[PDB]
């Protein structure tokens, strides 16, 4: 056996989460530092949903003050504990 | 914390001199008052708290006791009975989520 190469379309998880940092890294690169969109990592599942949900009782958080698009998904769940 | 001796004396004082055809009307001693006893009120792990999941069972215990009166080991409760809104002293190095 020698496998067929994971065709990128079914390979994720780690694959496409360093797929999406390099597609940030070549958007930066065609900015060149004018971009400079970072953090593309961090942190986890279900502490995020701990966390999110906190945010509903008024709560304060490490990523809440008073891939990259969970800060859409965030916003429109933020914006309702504001 | 001592003015309340002088509201007692006061107090003795008017029921004393209105009431006066009766034996003298009871008193506490003074150590009732002085007592911090009868007032509810009176290896620690070093690591900076670091372990997040251990964060919540260890300030937890501690909060089942500052619930009824004791301060605890990362809460502590600060030393007025000068005013009567008795305020509290978290450990500054915890998780944010879960000092708040």
């Not at chain 1, 940092?21 to 953090?39: I, S, W």
Request: charged share 25%.
């Amino acid at each position: 056996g020698h496998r067929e190469e994971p065709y990128l379309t079914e390979a994720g998880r780690d694959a496409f989460d360093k797929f999406c940092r390099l597609h940030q890294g070549e958007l930066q690169l065609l900015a060149g530092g004018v971009l400079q969109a970072p953090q593309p990592v961090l942190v986890k599942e279900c502490e995020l949903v701990k966390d999110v949900l906190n945010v509903l009782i008024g709560v304060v958080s490490a990523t809440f003050s008073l891939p990259e698009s969970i800060s859409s998904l965030l916003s429109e769940v933020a914006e309702y504990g504001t | 914390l001592q003015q309340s001796l002088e509201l007692k004396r006061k107090m003795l004082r008017d029921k004393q001199n209105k009431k006066n055809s009766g034996q003298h009307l009871p008193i506490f001693p003074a150590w009732v008052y002085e007592r911090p006893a009868l007032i509810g009120d009176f290896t620690a792990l070093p690591i900076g708290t670091l372990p997040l999941a251990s964060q919540e069972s260890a300030v937890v215990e501690d909060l089942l006791y500052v619930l009824v009166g004791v301060d605890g080991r990362y809460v502590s409760a600060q030393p007025l009975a000068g005013r009567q809104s008795r305020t509290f002293l978290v450990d500054p190095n915890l998780d944010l989520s879960i000092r708040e």
